[PDB]
Amino acid sequence: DDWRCARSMHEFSAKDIDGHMVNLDKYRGFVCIVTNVASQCGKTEVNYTQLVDLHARYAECGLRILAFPCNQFGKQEPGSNEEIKEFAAGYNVKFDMFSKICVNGDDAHPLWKWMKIQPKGKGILGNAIKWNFTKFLIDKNGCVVKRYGPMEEPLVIEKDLPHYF
């Protein structure tokens, strides 16, 4: 397992929602929020709207947001990448959308396997992602500094951003 030995998010790569591979070291020097999103879940509206809001509010300070669709939680992201892209455009999303992935299990994207065992990325009842819209806060060096649950509104992250800018 190479992914357990990575030291930074910047070591991983991921396909964006248009099918192009993105080297995540392009986010070096930015504070990031990484999150697993879904279109048909109870917290879809509050998360998209507050994430778009935090992005517009803190874009000039370097806030970036990475959104990975995931259908493993109630099958609440069943659509195609194009549908998810159009869904996100309806919220006026300007952050970075990726291709749908798994975040749990043997086939999970290795970025997500790594985040979950980071000291500040651990969960309480096991490390697995529990539901849609788990949020990880990534410092400018690519390390995980905080994990927020599916039921935590994205605005609760705001108080912590000044310490990493």
UniProtKB/Swiss-Prot annotation:
UniProt entry tagged with the keyword DNA repair: no
Reactions the enzyme catalyzes: a hydroperoxy polyunsaturated fatty acid + 2 glutathione = a hydroxy polyunsaturated fatty acid + glutathione disulfide + H2O; 2 glutathione + H2O2 = glutathione disulfide + 2 H2O; tert-butyl hydroperoxide + 2 glutathione = tert-butanol + glutathione disulfide + H2O; cumene hydroperoxide + 2 glutathione = 2-phenylpropan-2-ol + glutathione disulfide + H2O
GO CC annotations, alphabetized: cytosol; extracellular exosome; mitochondrion; nuclear envelope; nucleus; protein-containing complex
Residues recorded as bearing Phosphoserine in the entry: S8
Expression sites (tissue/organ): Present primarily in testis. Expressed in platelets (at protein level).
Domain of life of the organism encoding this protein: Eukaryota
EC number of the protein: 1.11.1.12, 1.11.1.9
Role description: Essential antioxidant peroxidase that directly reduces phospholipid hydroperoxide even if they are incorporated in membranes and lipoproteins. Can also reduce cholesterol hydroperoxide and thymine hydroperoxide. Plays a key role in protecting cells from oxidative damage by preventing membrane lipid peroxidation. Required to prevent cells from ferroptosis, a non-apoptotic cell death resulting from an iron-dependent accumulation of lipid reactive oxygen species.
Family affiliation: Belongs to the glutathione peroxidase family.
Disease listed for this protein: Spondylometaphyseal dysplasia, Sedaghatian type: A form of spondylometaphyseal dysplasia, a group of short stature disorders distinguished by abnormalities in the vertebrae and the metaphyses of the tubular bones. SMDS is a neonatal lethal form characterized by severe metaphyseal chondrodysplasia with mild limb shortening, platyspondyly, cardiac conduction defects, and central nervous system abnormalities.
Assembly mode: Monomer. Has a tendency to form higher mass oligomers. Interacts with FUNDC1; this interaction promotes GPX4 recruitment into mitochondria through TOM/TIM complex where it is degraded by mitophagy.
Protein name: Phospholipid hydroperoxide glutathione peroxidase GPX4
Annotated source species: Homo sapiens (Human)
Source species taxonomy: Eukaryota, Metazoa, Chordata, Craniata, Vertebrata
Residues of the full protein shown: 33 to 197 of 197
